[PDB]
Design an enzyme around this catalytic site. Sequence first.
Site, PDB file in Angstrom:
ATOM      1  N   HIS A  84       0.811  -1.228   0.000  1.00 58.84           N
ATOM      2  CA  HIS A  84       0.000   0.000   0.000  1.00 58.84           C
ATOM      3  C   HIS A  84       0.853   1.293   0.000  1.00 58.84           C
ATOM      4  O   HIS A  84       0.295   2.373  -0.158  1.00 58.84           O
ATOM      5  CB  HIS A  84      -1.093   0.031   1.102  1.00 58.84           C
TER       6      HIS A  84
ATOM      7  N   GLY B 145       2.327   6.090  10.437  1.00 61.23           N
ATOM      8  CA  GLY B 145       3.715   5.935  10.025  1.00 61.23           C
ATOM      9  C   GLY B 145       4.379   4.668  10.539  1.00 61.23           C
ATOM     10  O   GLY B 145       5.575   4.454  10.310  1.00 61.23           O
TER      11      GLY B 145
ATOM     12  N   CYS C 205       3.384   1.543   9.703  1.00 64.60           N
ATOM     13  CA  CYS C 205       3.229   0.421   8.763  1.00 64.60           C
ATOM     14  C   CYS C 205       4.601  -0.060   8.286  1.00 64.60           C
ATOM     15  O   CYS C 205       5.524   0.745   8.163  1.00 64.60           O
ATOM     16  CB  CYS C 205       2.303   0.788   7.609  1.00 64.60           C
TER      17      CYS C 205
END
EC number: 3.4.19.12
Lengths: 301, 301
Positions: A41, A143, A145
């Site tokens: 993503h 932030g 991920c």
Amino acid sequence: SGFRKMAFPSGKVEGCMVQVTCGTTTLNGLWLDDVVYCPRHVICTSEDMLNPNYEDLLIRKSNHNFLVQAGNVQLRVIGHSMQNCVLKLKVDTANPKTPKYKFVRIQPGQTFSVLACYNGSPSGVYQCAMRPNFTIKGSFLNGSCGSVGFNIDYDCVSFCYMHHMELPTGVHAGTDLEGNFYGPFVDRQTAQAAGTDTTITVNVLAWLYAAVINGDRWFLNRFTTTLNDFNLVAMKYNYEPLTQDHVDILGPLSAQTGIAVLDMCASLKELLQNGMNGRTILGSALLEDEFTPFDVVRQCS
Amino acid sequence: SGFRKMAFPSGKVEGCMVQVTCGTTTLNGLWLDDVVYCPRHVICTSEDMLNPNYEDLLIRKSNHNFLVQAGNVQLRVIGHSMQNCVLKLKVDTANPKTPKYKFVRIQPGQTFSVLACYNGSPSGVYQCAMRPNFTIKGSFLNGSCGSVGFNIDYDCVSFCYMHHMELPTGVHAGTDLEGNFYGPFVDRQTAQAAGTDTTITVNVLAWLYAAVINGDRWFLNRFTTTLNDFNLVAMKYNYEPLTQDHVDILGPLSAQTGIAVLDMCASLKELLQNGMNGRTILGSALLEDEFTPFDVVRQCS
Ligand SMILES: [Mg+2]
């Protein structure tokens, strides 16, 4: 003595954390050998969140669109591919800090340490379990991920989770290091809810065995139970069913204390019925379910 | 979202752990620059521990009597001296993995991460607070003596603790990195007990702020109190007195949530007097006191 929720020393994982940037999105990456792994993503924009066509978004990318930053050094992307929900960025340098590692897909009830990271720099380490509903109760801000979950088996780092998203209930969803999500989750911004959560029964039993090992017996009773009657009771308190595998896994703890698995199940049926009556077990006023039988043997011996 | 007991990433400290042997006794040492720091009781046999004369035992020991192992490499002890309850072994080689560091003495109520080791090998990391009785509620088995506590500010490691002993109630006692004990303890195998402990009030309040930040608001009320009225409640329930410095320190959390410290004190007053009534706060049936205001701000913001 003492029973702490202990995480693995994070050092071997810290040396692999890098920052991955694609457009305006910045997240974390796992640098092992000459490959950096991250949530796919990272290639999505404000428009590519409900229905991203990852293959279409990715065909439009070149290697130089990906900015990888290991500490202060910029890494050079020389290849890119997608495997399930993870992006694999081939880089021009193999990580000299790459530990001995393997990728392992865990099952619900298993525990692991999480090294929470932001901008490729480690923030903190904490102990987690894969809930029966395939979510994790973590601590992640925007932030985070690409932050990973792991176990350390002697000197081998077993990577078992990569962080992808937070569901509306404040719980977390992610994939193994091959990009396969745990649970029925998808890397899409559509409405998806975690199934009803249950208590990891095998872990509570193991932690009750850890309490006996550290000198506590106030909760034991003179009764026993069949495996079926235990499950008929436990499932009324939202406990996961206990299987013959679970009973076998507790065998070594049963032999160490001298309390049969089904005698411990009878003590758990009573604890569910009476509560703790102002008492604590291992310093807790609740029945702890994030210590596996393997963690109990490894921590208190 | 999510609130977890989080430790600092332990990598900078893992690179400093060494094994120190003196006769039969093997424990952990901290290798910073060209000095290995370890508990001075490493020189004691089991008979010596009854009433030791460390100056007498040390002058009768020479450099070669200390076996310092850094991984698979033997370190040569070229000097040995004592600072309070800490033995300093000057070695021939400086540690190339030495981080930017300081030795600091922490106050009761302050938190820190512990890297638990066995034969110079880190096995786990956990977060804990220096109790008002100067003990720590850790998880240690035989061979953990010399395991250290620390905080990371930016890239600077502030070493604050070194494990020396376990007390008969399961809790642990140790020194700062200059050998000064936390608490009325001595490094001698004698009848020593932890004093009656108290709850860290400013830390419970910080944790109630973290609960509010994470959507847990059931305990909030329309009421406020005064510092004087609340401290009478605190004294009655074995809570540390709340000072004006504590209210000032909680200022950012009061402003971020719109709940004044004495407004949150009226919530804590009610939880102490009436209990939780079947409810939990951040998945806990006990009021958590091992998160400082700074820990909450660091993890939530
Ligand atoms: Mg109020």
